[PDB]
Ligand binder design. Structure first.
Ligand SMILES: Cn1nc2c(c1NC(=O)[C@@H]1CCCN1S(=O)(=O)c1ccc(F)cc1)CCC2
Length: 116
């Protein structure tokens, strides 16, 4: 509260580390469904069903332009990519399984990087 400061983790490397994690995502074999926005003009239902589209290129642009205030908001957008994928694609379709694979890949990099 006012004048009662809680010790806070050092956040000075967060931008560089989130960029490194995002680069590992972008170069993963199964990143191809997520590198670019889903084409809202070619995919029936997507714009209507998926209220907040998100993809790696948009995350990369936002990271490169100061649009993430903290690392938690970055992880929210990454997770949004895979939540969208799981809403729209069957679990064992190629895109659907890619999404499950990429979520697991991400969460392990996240804990390995930022949990101690
Ligand atoms: C995440 N998500 N969820 C759904 C879809 C997708 N991703 C796509 O659409 C991506 C986005 C841009 C193009 N493509 S692509 O067609 O898949 C593609 C990508 C690389 C490549 F070399 C060949 C084809 C579509 C149906 C629902």
């Amino acid at each position: 509260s006012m004048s009662v400061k809680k010790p806070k983790r050092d956040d000075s490397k967060d931008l560089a580390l989130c960029s490194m994690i995002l680069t590992e995502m972008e170069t993963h074999e199964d990143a191809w469904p997520f590198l670019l926005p889903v084409n809202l003009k070619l995919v029936p239902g997507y714009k209507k069903v998926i209220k907040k589209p998100m993809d790696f290129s948009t995350i990369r642009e936002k990271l490169s332009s100061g649009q993430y205030p903290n690392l938690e908001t970055f992880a929210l957008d990454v997770r949004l990519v895979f939540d969208n994928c799981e809403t729209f694609n069957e679990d064992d379709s190629d895109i659907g399984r890619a999404g499950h694979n990429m979520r697991k890949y991400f969460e392990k990099k996240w804990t390995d990087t930022f949990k101690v």
